[PDB]
Write a protein that binds this ligand. Sequence first.
Ligand code: V03
Lengths: 300, 237
Amino acid sequence: MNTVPFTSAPIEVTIGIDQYSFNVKENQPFHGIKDIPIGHVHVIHFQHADNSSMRYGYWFDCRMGNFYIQYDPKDGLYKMMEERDGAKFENIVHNFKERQMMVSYPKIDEDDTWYNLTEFVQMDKIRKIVRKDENQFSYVDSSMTTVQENELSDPAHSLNYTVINFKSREAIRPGHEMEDFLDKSYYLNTVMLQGIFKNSSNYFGELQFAFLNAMFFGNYGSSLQWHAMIELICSSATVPKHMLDKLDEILYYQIKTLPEQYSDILLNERVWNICLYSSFQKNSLHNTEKIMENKYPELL
Amino acid sequence: GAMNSSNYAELFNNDIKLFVDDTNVYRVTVHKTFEGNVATKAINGCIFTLNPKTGHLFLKIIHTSVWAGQKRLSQLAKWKTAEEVSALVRSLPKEEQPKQIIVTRKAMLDPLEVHMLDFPNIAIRPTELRLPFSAAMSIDKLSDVVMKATEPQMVLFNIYDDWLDRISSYTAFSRLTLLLRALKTNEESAKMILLSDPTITIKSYHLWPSFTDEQWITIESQMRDLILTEYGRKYNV
Ligand SMILES: COc1ccc([C@@H](N)CCO)cc1
């Protein structure tokens, strides 16, 4: 179990940790989060009580260092930082846990939600999409744009997701124009899985990370990425059977975890109706289709 | 963007453009089988590719053999149209390539866009106009070359005959669309009009009769009367 200690909470803020969130009042005696499960990536995120504009936050893995949060009154936000002096980190944390100034990561023991949402997500891959190599954690916020969004403007502050484009020379083999546009198996399997991602785990990991950034930060570019990667599989006639089954689980938990009131902005009616009722894989997402139809029969 | 009544004169500026119409590419007769079922029999078709400024018509004849052993022909037809159009552009010198292609049906946008990925600077556009180019097979010499073809084949026409010697391309395109709209609403009446007078002939190198200016005005009035007529006969007005 690991700990994300906070120097202080000078401004009223809603703090999120993975799929949980709690209110902290201005200058309340709050000094961080404990009992955070080892073995998974985590995201700690923030929405100031004043400016609900800009949700922001930090992806991190406690195995990769000792990390803490401190408010920066010049830049006006809660910043993640690394304490390399491990001994000195221990005496800060113990003192706070003795005075019980920390909230406990509130994991129910029956609940695999977070695992099921981050199964394939790995810090090494997050740090390649969010390029900032002097830190071991990665900052994301609502307003960051993707590399493909900048092609249609600061490169340092971009999400370097894998560009997917169904009407591109990379997607479409000369002489197979109709074939490759109506059945994207080549693009999925050879270009993306074999050429770019190497394996389906790296693919699912980017897909899962795109969803989470869309849900937690309302990052529009991430939502576009998440939908693109679903649609590419659903529009491929030839997909490894293990990937279809795994995709159905992955989407099942994503749909389960989405806030019911955000469905209108995070869920693209066209992609989902196509994927569930028209595409090659319209019969292969049984869990995802059952939860979608019982929870959001509207969008369909 | 899309083409409509408001940016209508762009057709006649000096940027090369082509209209592509696919409505005669895949053509069938529907008949009864011995068992009393229904089957289709394909007949030859054509892609209607027209430069509206010069009148040049690139008539790509689609021989029925291209459908042999293929499924979902109506969908293949759009991709076949896109493939032929892309091959035509590729065959033209760079300074003759179009800067825009306007498709007359929106289902062509994605097939053409995909076939033209090598040409990122050629804009592919739809239109809101209800252009009558499907009636091009009512032009006797065009229908004749399509029906006679025994292999894939392209034939070049000027659908304006020699009109641009006397009128502008705007006026020439307006005449053409009026003639085709009439042939489409009532083909027999429209054809009776163009040919009632034996003394007016079609030159061997022309599609339409050699009318004087004054005879064209009378012709065009008769086509308008027809198109209004059939609109009453149809809507009981
Ligand atoms: C609340 O956790 C903390 C607070 C401060 C530190 C130190 N880096 C600050 C001294 O340079 C480390 C951890």
